[PDB]
Design an enzyme around this catalytic site. Structure first.
Site, mmCIF file in Angstrom:
data_model
loop_
_atom_site.group_PDB
_atom_site.id
_atom_site.type_symbol
_atom_site.label_atom_id
_atom_site.label_comp_id
_atom_site.label_asym_id
_atom_site.label_seq_id
_atom_site.Cartn_x
_atom_site.Cartn_y
_atom_site.Cartn_z
ATOM 1 N N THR A 46 -18.141 41.820 -25.888
ATOM 2 C CA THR A 46 -18.932 40.590 -26.143
ATOM 3 C C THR A 46 -20.320 40.725 -25.516
ATOM 4 O OG1 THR A 46 -16.919 39.411 -26.361
ATOM 5 C CG2 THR A 46 -18.855 38.057 -25.886
ATOM 6 N N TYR A 134 -7.472 48.294 -21.956
ATOM 7 C CA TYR A 134 -7.983 47.351 -22.971
ATOM 8 C C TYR A 134 -7.536 47.916 -24.321
ATOM 9 C CZ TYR A 134 -11.479 44.521 -25.527
ATOM 10 O OH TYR A 134 -12.119 43.669 -26.383
ATOM 11 N N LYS A 163 -5.675 44.170 -20.897
ATOM 12 C CA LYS A 163 -6.305 43.228 -21.825
ATOM 13 C C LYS A 163 -5.707 43.528 -23.192
ATOM 14 C CE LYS A 163 -10.469 41.270 -23.794
ATOM 15 N NZ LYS A 163 -11.859 41.549 -24.243
#
Lengths: 294, 294, 294, 294
Positions: A46, A134, A163
C-alpha cells in the site's frame, strides 16, 4: 506479543510534484497512533514500494520509526523476489530500529515450496528481529502451503507469524494446527478480518485503517476481547468502505480517501493512477456511511 | 522485420559460486547463432533478471551485444513495475547498442489499463529503438487487452510487436484485427508456438531454443514458409521437451538441460533452485526423443 | 472415420410460444447440408438440451436423422452426469439411426479421473457406434487429462475422438502423442479452430457454422488441405462473428443471428434469454463484415 | 423460518446392489435428529441427486419427511438447470410436505444475471413455501451477485435465505447489507462455517454433520450463542475431518466415513466412486482425532 490488533499498511504520500511528502507523512503517522492504531507497516504493498528510490525506501522507514517513538511497533516492509536483496532490506530495517520485518513471497519468478523455504530461512537467519511471512497469491501467484509455513516455524525461531492475504479462511485453521496457537496470524484482507479472527487471527495489517484508524482499532479490540456482536456492528459500518477502497487498484482508492480528509495530496507514481470520478463518489458515500464525513 | 523466427530467451549462466559465468555465456551465445537462432533476449524471464545486480544486468546485455556482433538482433529485457526504472533500463539498453527492448507488463503492483497505457507510452517515448510489449498474466497477474494494445500501437510508432505469453491463441487473431497485420506477434509459449503462428505469429521468444536452437530454428522456418506439415513433424519431436522443461519452475529445467549438454553449471540464484532427480530424468528422456543426446 | 471438417452444433429452434419449431429445424438442417456442413450434432450444448423434455430430446435427434437422409453423419448428443442415463441416451440415439454419439464429461457432480474412465467405458460398451469424448472444463469444471483420454482410447475400440473445448491448444499435441495421430480431434472452440488444426485437429464442432455454414466449411477444407494461408484469410473474415456470437451466453447470440437471416424465431427457454439490442448490433455488424447480409 | 444451526446435507445410502437403502436411511435420519441436527436437506449435492431416478428422488424426500415427523424442518433439494423442471420439483417437494426448498443456480448452461433472476422468480412464484438460493460457483461456474440476490429478495416474498458455497466470506457482509439482517445465510462450506457465522451466518448446510452430527450441532449452537471461543475449540477438533472428507470428490469421503461408523454400505453411483485406501486412512485418523472411533 506486540503484533496484535489494527496495524496500518501505510500509504507513502507524494506532493503535487511526486516527491516524498515527509511533512504529511509525519502528521499522518502521528494521527494514526492518536486514533488507536496498534502498529505500522511502512513501505508495504500500500506504500508503493515498487516506485520508491532506494533512498526514499530507507527514508520512509526512518521517519516512520522516528515519529512512532517506541509508542507502537514498526513492522518494516522488506520484500524482494531476490533472496540476497531481501536480506539487505531486512538487515537495513533492523539497523534503522524496526521491531519486525514483513517479507513477501517472491513475486514474478514463481518459486516452488523448496525455494520459498530457502528464501525465508536465509532472510530470517540474516537478522535478529521477528519476521512475518506475507503470503499473497493475488500478487505473487505462488502460495506458501501450511506445510511449508510449518517447516519454517519448526526450523526458524524468529518466524513468528503471517500476513495471510489468501482470502481462504480455512488456512487460519490449518496454520493454527501446523504452526501452533502462538503463531501470530494477521489478516491480509480488510473485508474478511472478522472471520479471520474467528478462526484464530489476532489482528489485521489493514488498508482501511489508513482512512478509519479509530473504527478499525475498535473493531480489532472487539474481536480480541471476544465481542463478536460488537465486531459485526462495526463490520456493518466499515464494509461499504472495505469494498469501495478496492474498486480500483490499491492504493488509488486509499490515496483519494485520505486526500478527501485533507491529510495528503491525491498523487500516485506510474503505473499506479488516481481513481475516476465514479469510484471517488462510491468512496465518499462509503465514508459518510462510516461517519468519517458529514 | 528482423524480429521473426526462433528468438532465444537466454539463460544467465552462474559458476559453482553463483557469479555470472561470462565464459560459458560467450560460448553459448555464439553456439546459439551458429545453430540458426534469429534473435537474442538477454536478461528476460528465463535469464533470472530478478537476482542480477544492476552491474550484472548491464554486463549480460553488453556481452550479449559484443558476441552477437550485428549477426542477429539483440532485444534487451528492460522490464520494471516502476515506469521511471523501466525508462532508465530501456535508455541504457539503447545506449549499449540493443536493436530493440522487451518490456513486461508491471508485475506485483497490478495497474489498470490506463496505468499500462501510461507505463508503455512513457517508456517507448524515452527511446528511439523498437519496443516489444511482453504480456504475461501468469507472472504479472494483470493482462493488457487487445484494445489497450491497439491504443498504444495507434499512438506510439516504435511499439512494433508483442511477446504474447497469455496462452490464449484467439488473442493472436484479436491483436491482428486491432493492432494490424504489420504488428509483430511472437509466441511467449513454446508448446503453442505452432497454433500461434497459424493465427498470424511470425516467431517465438523461446525457452526450448536454449536447448534445441537448431530444431527450434527449423520449426519456426517451416511455419514462416507455410510448411505447417513439416512444423507439425517438428512439434512431434519437440513437444516432450516443451513439457519436461516446465515440470519445475523456469529456468530450473532449462539450466539442468544445458548443464547436461556440458554447456553450463546447474546453478540458480535463490529463490530459484535446481530440479529434483525425477524431473532431470524426464528432461534426459525428452532430449533423447529430440535426438540431442544418446 | 467421416468425422472431419465443419460439423455444426445445431441450435434447437422454438416458435413464438416456446414449442420445438420442427418446420424451421428441418429447413435449417437441410440448408446446413446444402451449404457444405460435413456433420451434424443435434441436442448438444448449443441445442439447449437442458430445457428439452425427454420427448423433445428424442424428436430433435429423429428429425435431424430423417432430414440428413445419410448425406452427412449425425453425431447425436447423448450427455448426462448420470452414467445409467448416458447409457440409455446413447442406446436410444443408436436405435434411432445416429452414426455416432457426443458424450460430455459429467457436469455438476465433479468426478475424478477414475470416475470419468468408468463413465466413458460403461457408455461406449453399451453401444456399437463410435463415441466422441466432449472435454469442456468451462461447463463441467473437471478436465479429462490426456492420460485418462489415452487409457479410454487404448481400452475402448469405439472411442474414436474428442471434441476438445479446453481452449488449451497444447492439449492437441499431448492427446496426439498419447492417443496417436489417428485419434480424431475436433475443436470445441470456434476462435481457436485454426491453431487447433495446426497442432493436428481434423475439424471443429462449431457454433459459428450455424450462421456461416459455407465459410466455416471452406475454412475447415482449407485447414485439411494444408492451405493455412487461405484459412487465415477466412479467420480475418470470421473472427468478428466468432467474438460477437459469444458476447452473451451461448446460444443467445447464435439464435439472434439465425433470426436475423430469417431462419428461426429469436426465442430461448429460461434460464437462457434473448440478447440485448447493443449485442444484436455487434452481431449484425460482424455478419456484414463476413458478407452474410447487406 | 427457524432455519438455523447444523443442517445436514444428507447422503443417500445405496445397498451392495446400488439400490436405495431405505432401512439404513430411516435409521440414519433418526440418529441425526437424536444427535441434535437442526434440519435436513434430502436429495442435495451430497445426496447424489444426479444419479437418482425421478421415483427415487420423490421417495428419498417422502421417507425424509416421514422419519422427521415434524421434529426438524426438511429443506428438500429441488435444483435444475431447466426452470420448468425446477418448478415441477419445488411443487412436488411442497405437495410431499417439505418445510422449504433448496434451489441451486443452473449448472452447465451458464445463464447471465437476467437468466438467474427469471429462473428464481418463476420457481418461487410457483410455490407457497420458503425458497433458499444455493449459490455454488464451484459446481455451476456462474455466480449470483449480491445485487441480483437483493433484486430477488426485494421482488419475491418467499425468497428467505441463501446456502452460500462461494467460500468468499465478504459475500456474507455484502448479502447482509443488500438483502438485510433477517435474510437467512447458511454456510455452504464446512471449513469456513465459523467465519461465515462471525459475518452474520446463522448456520451451515453441512457435509461433516453426516459424520459428526453432535459435535457439528454443538459448534453451530456455540456460534449462535456468541461463544466463538468454544466454537474455535470445536473447529480445532473438526478441521482435520473437514479436510480429510474432501480429499476425494464429495460424497465419496462422507460415504466411506459413514460406512466406517457401521451406518451404511460404502457404495456410490457412477460417475462417483469409492475412495482409495490412502484417503480412507486419512479419514480414519481425522475421525480418531475428533473422538468418533478408537
Amino acid at each position: 506479543s506486540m503484533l496484535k490488533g489494527s496495524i496500518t499498511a501505510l500509504v507513502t504520500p507524494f506532493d503535487r510534484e511526486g516527491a516524498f511528502d515527509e511533512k504529511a507523512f509525519r502528521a499522518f503517522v502521528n494521527w494514526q497512533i492518536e486514533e488507536g492504531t496498534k502498529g505500522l507497516v511502512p513501505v508495504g504493498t500500500t506504500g508503493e514500494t515498487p516506485t520508491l528510490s532506494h533512498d526514499e525506501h530507507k527514508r520512509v522507514i526512518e521517519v516512520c520509526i522516528e515519529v512512532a517513538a517506541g509508542r507502537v511497533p514498526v513492522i518494516a516492509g522488506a520484500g524482494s523476489n531476490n533472496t540476497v536483496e531481501a536480506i539487505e532490506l531486512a538487515q537495513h530495517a533492523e539497523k534503522a530500529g524496526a521491531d519486525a520485518v514483513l517479507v513477501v513471497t517472491p513475486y514474478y519468478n514463481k518459486p516452488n515450496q523448496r525455494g520459498l523455504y530457502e528464501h525465508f530461512s536465509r532472510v530470517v537467519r540474516s537478522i535478529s528481529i521477528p519476521l512475518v511471512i506475507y503470503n499473497i497469491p493475488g500478487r505473487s501467484i505462488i502460495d506458501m502451503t501450511p506445510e511449508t509455513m510449518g517447516a519454517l516455524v519448526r526450523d526458524c525461531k524468529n518466524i513468528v507469524g503471517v500476513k495471510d492475504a489468501t482470502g481462504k479462511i480455512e488456512r487460519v485453521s490449518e496454520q493454527r494446527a501446523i504452526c501452533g496457537k502462538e503463531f501470530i496470524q494477521l489478516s491480509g484482507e480488510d473485508a474478511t478480518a472478522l472471520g479471520f479472527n474467528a478462526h484464530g487471527g489476532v489482528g489485521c495489517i489493514s488498508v482501511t485503517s489508513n482512512i478509519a484508524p479509530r473504527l478499525c482499532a475498535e473493531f480489532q479490540e472487539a474481536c480480541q476481547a471476544g465481542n463478536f456482536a460488537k465486531a459485526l456492528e462495526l463490520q456493518d459500518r466499515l464494509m461499504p468502505l472495505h469494498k469501495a477502497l478496492f474498486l480500483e487498484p490499491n492504493p488509488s482508492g486509499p490515496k483519494y480517501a485520505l486526500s478527501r480528509l485533507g491529510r495528503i495530496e491525491n498523487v500516485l507514481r506510474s503505473p499506479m493512477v488516481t481513481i475516476e470520478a465514479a469510484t471517488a463518489e462510491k468512496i465518499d458515500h462509503a465514508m459518510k456511511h462510516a461517519g468519517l464525513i458529514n
